[PDB]
Amino acid sequence: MPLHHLTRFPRLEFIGAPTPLEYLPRLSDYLGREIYIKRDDVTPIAMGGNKLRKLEFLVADALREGADTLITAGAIQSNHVRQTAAVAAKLGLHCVALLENPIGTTAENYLTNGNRLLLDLFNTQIEMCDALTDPDAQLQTLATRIEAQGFRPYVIPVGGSSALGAMGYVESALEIAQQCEEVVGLSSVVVASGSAGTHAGLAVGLEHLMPDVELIGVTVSRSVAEQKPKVIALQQAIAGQLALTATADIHLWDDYFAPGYGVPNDAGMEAVKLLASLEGVLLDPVYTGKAMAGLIDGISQKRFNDDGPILFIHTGGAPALFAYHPHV
Amino acid sequence: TRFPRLEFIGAPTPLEYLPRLSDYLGREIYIKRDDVTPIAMGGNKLRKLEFLVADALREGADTLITAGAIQSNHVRQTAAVAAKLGLHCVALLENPIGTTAENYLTNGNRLLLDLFNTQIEMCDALTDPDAQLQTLATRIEAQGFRPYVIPVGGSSALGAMGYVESALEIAQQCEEVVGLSSVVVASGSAGTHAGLAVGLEHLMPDVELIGVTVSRSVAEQKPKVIALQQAIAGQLALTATADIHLWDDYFAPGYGVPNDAGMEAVKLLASLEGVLLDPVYTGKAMAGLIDGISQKRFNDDGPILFIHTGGAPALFAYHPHV
Numbered sequence: 005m006p007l008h009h010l011t012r013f014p015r016l017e018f019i020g021a022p023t024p025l026e027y028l029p030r031l032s033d034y035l036g037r038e039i040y041i042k043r044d045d046v047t048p049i050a051m052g053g054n055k056l057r058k059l060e061f062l063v064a065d066a067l068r069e070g071a072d073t074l075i076t077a078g079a080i081q082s083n084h085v086r087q088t089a090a091v092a093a094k095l096g097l098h099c100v101a102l103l104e105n106p107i108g109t110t111a112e113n114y115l116t117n118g119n120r121l122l123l124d125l126f127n128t129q130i131e132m133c134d135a136l137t138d139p140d141a142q143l144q145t146l147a148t149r150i151e152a153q154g155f156r157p158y159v160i161p162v163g164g165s166s167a168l169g170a171m172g173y174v175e176s177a178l179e180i181a182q183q184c185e186e187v188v189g190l191s192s193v194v195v196a197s198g199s200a201g202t203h204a205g206l207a208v209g210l211e212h213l214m215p216d217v218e219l220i221g222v223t224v225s226r227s228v229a230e231q232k233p234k235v236i237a238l239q240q241a242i243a244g245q246l247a248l249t250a251t252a253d254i255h256l257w258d259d260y261f262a263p264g265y266g267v268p269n270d271a272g273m274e275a276v277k278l279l280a281s282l283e284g285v286l287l288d289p290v291y292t293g294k295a296m297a298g299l300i301d302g303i304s305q306k307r308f309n310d311d312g313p314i315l316f317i318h319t320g321g322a323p324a325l326f327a328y329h330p331h332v
Numbered sequence: 333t334r335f336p337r338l339e340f341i342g343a344p345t346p347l348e349y350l351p352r353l354s355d356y357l358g359r360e361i362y363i364k365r366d367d368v369t370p371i372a373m374g375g376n377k378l379r380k381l382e383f384l385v386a387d388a389l390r391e392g393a394d395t396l397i398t399a400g401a402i403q404s405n406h407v408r409q410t411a412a413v414a415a416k417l418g419l420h421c422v423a424l425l426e427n428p429i430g431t432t433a434e435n436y437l438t439n440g441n442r443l444l445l446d447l448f449n450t451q452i453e454m455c456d457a458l459t460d461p462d463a464q465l466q467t468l469a470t471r472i473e474a475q476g477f478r479p480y481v482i483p484v485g486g487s488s489a490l491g492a493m494g495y496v497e498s499a500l501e502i503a504q505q506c507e508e509v510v511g512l513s514s515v516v517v518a519s520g521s522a523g524t525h526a527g528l529a530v531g532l533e534h535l536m537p538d539v540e541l542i543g544v545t546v547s548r549s550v551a552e553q554k555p556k557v558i559a560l561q562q563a564i565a566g567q568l569a570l571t572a573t574a575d576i577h578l579w580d581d582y583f584a585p586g587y588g589v590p591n592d593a594g595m596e597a598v599k600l601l602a603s604l605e606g607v608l609l610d611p612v613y614t615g616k617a618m619a620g621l622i623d624g625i626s627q628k629r630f631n632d633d634g635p636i637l638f639i640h641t642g643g644a645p646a647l648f649a650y651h652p653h654v
């Protein structure tokens with residue numbers, strides 16, 4: 005009942021059936037607690053990820069406007085850009101990507117392989133910038149010049165993280181609650197927290213469907229201080245768009261992303277090696293490896309509410325493995 | 333259903349209309365998304381591993397042993413499954429093209445092998461794969477492990493049962509939504525081809541199955557597919573009378589080397605549909621499908637189903653060149 009205003013928003017279908025929610029018996033054995041995983045890395049468009057959920061809503065909205073071009077921004081190895089470009093090609097929309105190099109690498113695989121490779125396959129128009137210092141303004145500058153060519157453009161923010169985009173993860177929460185019914189009583193849910201729409205959609209959904217479940221966002225780019233107001237605004241705007249309130253507090257851990265966004269760290273790469281070796285599951289150096297390292301330290305240091313089951317949201321990211329090898 | 337099987341896939345994989353590609357080609361083209369199986373970037377081999385690794389467990393094996401190219405998709409999938417189950421994986425690898433290109437050597441599927449803690453054994457050539465795996469199975473057993481051997485591509489009669497299963501999905505998914513005329517799959521180690529051959533003969537007898545070869549001539553390949561076809565049919569107490577159809581014009585200059593038509597097929601599907609093929613298998617098979625339209629080489633000009641057998645992580649190994 006509580007989330008029924010969701011059907012008011014037009015949406016496309018890119019996924020179809022609920023993504024798998026699987027027990028991780030070997031990781032659970034090693035960690036000493038029940039770990040489950042939500043497999044949003046297996047969404048069926050061009051190597052999947054958390055963004056296909058958001059794009060179902062955003063692109064549906066783009067088409068309502070009669071738009072024929074999608075314009076977004078991110079890192080050279082951004083998964084969002086890649087899923088956006090894939091969806092654009094699929095629909096015969098044009099796509100324009102404002103890309104940056106957030107880490108100052110000159111490594112050829114970072115510059116040319118992985119997610120950046122696939123963008124050329126989708127015929128993405130690539131616009132390089134020194135830095136995404138003001139992505140929203142920079143995207144509007146780009147859309148103006150693109151509009152001048154006669155294109156009918158639609159601006160998708162970094163990570164598709166607007167209140168409309170985040171509706172995909174309100175919907176994920178409905179899936180998750182449905183799959184967990186009578187099978188597992190969850191205590192905690194862990195997801196990486198970057199552009200913030202995934203965290204925020206899940207925050208709203210879980211508050212209304214699974215009140216007593218603790219949602220933990222592991223930051224990938226920012227301190228709790230910088231990040232919390234970003235999640236809160238989406239949460240609040242999302243709630244209002246669904247005619248609900250949201251009084252849940254937002255929870256964030258920021259101890260797992262140093263030296264900074266897009267830079268691999270030891271605990272992240274050890275989490276990647278753990279999931280691969282024990283579960284045959286592929287994480288990534290930027291997002292999920294670092295999120296999972298937070299889950300692990302969280303168990304180690306007893307940072308969760310209790311000792312009960314934890315759901316890790318696999319938000320994708322694997323193609324970046326190939327861009328980060330051998331280094332930088 | 334008389335064979336023990338492990339659950340690696342679950343729900344039937346999508347079967348989709350490809351409207352933009354259909355528009356461009358002037359033919360109705362559908363796709364079977366076996367690239368979207370949920371284990372370590374998927375592929376056609378997981379269908380086979382459901383039967384093969386179930387068999388391994390029945391024998392109380394603690395180690396999976398298989399063979400392939402450095403960038404073999406099958407090796408990668410076997411290792412992922414091995415990891416997931418707490419089995420050791422030993423892989424026998426060759427460099428089938430003599431490249432020194434770093435991405436082919438260490439990126440793509442070969443990078444994942446290290447993540448899955450795969451024990452890597454290098455060999456000069458897989459000249460007799462069945463024999464060399466058996467020599468390796470002896471060595472590893474001598475160290476105190478209990479190995480189970482999986483052939484190249486897991487293409488035994490038992491493994492190919494995965495693709496008789498796939499046919500069931502296809503048959504259910506295609507009716508009533510279309511009036512299919514032709515099916516196209518890449519034909520390599522022959523497990524995927526022969527399994528679909530048995531299944532489609534019985535389930536959709538009016539459809540033409542075409543295997544585009546990726547490593548051999550029609551003369552070298554046809555007995556391979558026919559033999560598996562007969563072996564599979566026997567173990568299911570069925571008779572398989574149907575012809576095997578093979579086109580071999582689409583893989584020069586050899587296995588694991590990309591060609592222009594294949595890369596143009598990779599580009600075409602990515603740009604028109606947001607679908608990713610690969611330089612070794614599906615790209616070359618799709619090029620075969622496209623040329624069949626220009627040369628009017630299909631039995632009739634009706635709907636075609638392409639079987640996406642996976643392969644995409646190879647893109648990252650093959651870039652920027654080999």
Ligand SMILES: Cc1ncc(COP(=O)(O)O)c(CNC2(C(=O)O)CC2)c1O
Nearest residue numbers: 082083084163198199200202319320321
């Ligand atoms: C695999 C993966 N996991 C988690 C996240 C974090 O999600 P949010 O951006 O919704 O907070 C991303 C985001 N990535 C960004 C991108 O540009 O790709 C949006 C920043 C992701 O790609």
Ligand SMILES: Cc1ncc(COP(=O)(O)O)c(CNC2(C(=O)O)CC2)c1O
Nearest residue numbers: 404405406485520521522524613641643
């Ligand atoms: C993506 C992809 N597509 C098609 C095929 C051909 O299937 P068959 O081997 O069943 O004929 C492979 C094979 N795999 C090879 C490997 O070593 O990876 C020869 C097995 C494949 O990986």
